[PDB]
């Protein structure tokens, strides 16, 4: 078995969510991750 690899080394979309209710707390994207 070859485990998938999620290599976040380019821009990505994100959400922070309540798993139960589905409510979206936060959402956005990272185009520029550097300090």
């Amino acid at each position: 078995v070859l485990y998938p690899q999620v290599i976040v080394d380019h821009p990505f979309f994100f959400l922070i969510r309540n798993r139960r209710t589905g409510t979206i707390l936060f959402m956005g994207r990272v185009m520029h991750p550097e300090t």
């Binding site: 999620v6 380019h10 821009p11 979309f13 922070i16 969510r17 979206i24 936060f26 550097e34």
Partner: protein, 322 residues
């Protein structure tokens, strides 16, 4: 579910106005703030909000229905300004709003006071929501919501595993960043990108089993912008319902994101315009027909690291008399 469509609609506006920049906001915070405003609105002004927020098909009951997770509301009311008893009652019932009386003419003092409240309810993560430049004799009311979250990953990254990696921006430029790593049991799925024509969805739970972070990533050869138009409420649901818990090799940057957004522009894009004009109907909040919504403010902070995440968002509403 409403919030679902709301979140996506608001996000789309921000993509439109946010050329190639980071984006971060809290649709939840924005809904709670607009909930409070709605309590004040009537007639045409209320109807427009209800529609824009998707409430036509009350919503106050859903809004009420609300690791560390904290949600706080506060009302700052000009001394001797007579606010409808009914407004006050509902505001407590549905939003458990703190109510404070202030002199907005003492503009430095009031800014400091409101900012302290914000700090006190965001672990100091959001600063300078307001300034003394926001307040004068014409200010009658400010309403604020804060959302704050802090959680450890259920499965933390070990700092020893963090290494410098090249991150390739969508403009093809590169930066070297700290790249966390673990092989962990997370929720994972693959979806067609509409074109190796797939994108990955990874959901990482926090301690407490209530909250998670969902990450969506295009194939390396493809810009995020290719996936963005796909993002709709129905898809978000599908993602949640399609991911499978399994071992995954995860490389994730340690990162912080911040954003202040033009909340008035965003709300207007939803179709909310009347509250922002002189002849708005806020007769729900008082018998004073001179009142309208002057400024709408939203600021957010997110930190992602080996231990977990810490996030805050604050929405502020400043009402004035013409």
């Amino acid at each position: 579910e409403a919030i679902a469509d709301l979140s996506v609609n608001m996000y789309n506006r921000l993509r439109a106005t946010g050329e190639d920049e980071n984006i971060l906001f809290s649709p939840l915070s924005i809904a709670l703030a607009m909930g409070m405003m709605e309590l004040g609105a009537q007639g045409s002004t209320q109807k427009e909000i209800r529609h824009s927020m998707g409430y036509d098909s009350e919503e106050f009951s859903f809004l009420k229905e609300f690791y560390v997770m904290k949600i706080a509301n506060s009302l700052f009311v000009q001394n001797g300004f007579h606010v409808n008893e009914e407004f006050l009652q509902m505001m407590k019932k549905y939003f458990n709003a703190a109510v404070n009386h202030v002199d907005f003419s003492q503009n430095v003092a009031v800014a400091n006071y409101i900012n302290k409240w914000v700090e006190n309810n965001t672990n100091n993560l959001v600063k300078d929501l307001v300034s003394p430049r926001d307040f004068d004799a014409a200010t009658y009311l400010a309403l604020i919501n804060a959302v704050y979250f802090k959680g450890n990953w259920k499965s933390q990254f070990r700092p020893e595993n963090t290494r410098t990696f090249s991150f390739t921006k969508d403009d093809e430029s590169e930066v070297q960043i700290p790249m966390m790593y673990q092989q962990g049991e997370f929720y994972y799925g693959e979806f067609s990108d509409g074109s190796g024509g797939i994108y990955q969805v990874l959901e990482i739970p926090y301690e407490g089993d209530e909250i998670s972070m969902m990450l969506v990533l295009s194939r390396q050869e493809v810009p995020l912008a290719t996936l963005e138009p796909l993002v709709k409420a129905q898809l978000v649901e599908e993602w949640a319902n399609s991911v499978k818990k399994q071992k995954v090799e995860v490389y994730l940057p340690r990162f912080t994101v911040e954003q202040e957004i033009d909340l008035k522009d965003v709300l207007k894009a939803l179709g909310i315009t009347e509250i922002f004009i002189k002849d708005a109907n806020l007769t729900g909040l008082s018998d004073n027909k001179e009142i309208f919504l002057s400024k709408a403010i939203h600021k957010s902070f997110l930190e992602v690291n080996e231990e977990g995440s810490e996030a805050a968002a604050v929405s502020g509403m400043i009402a004035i008399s013409r």
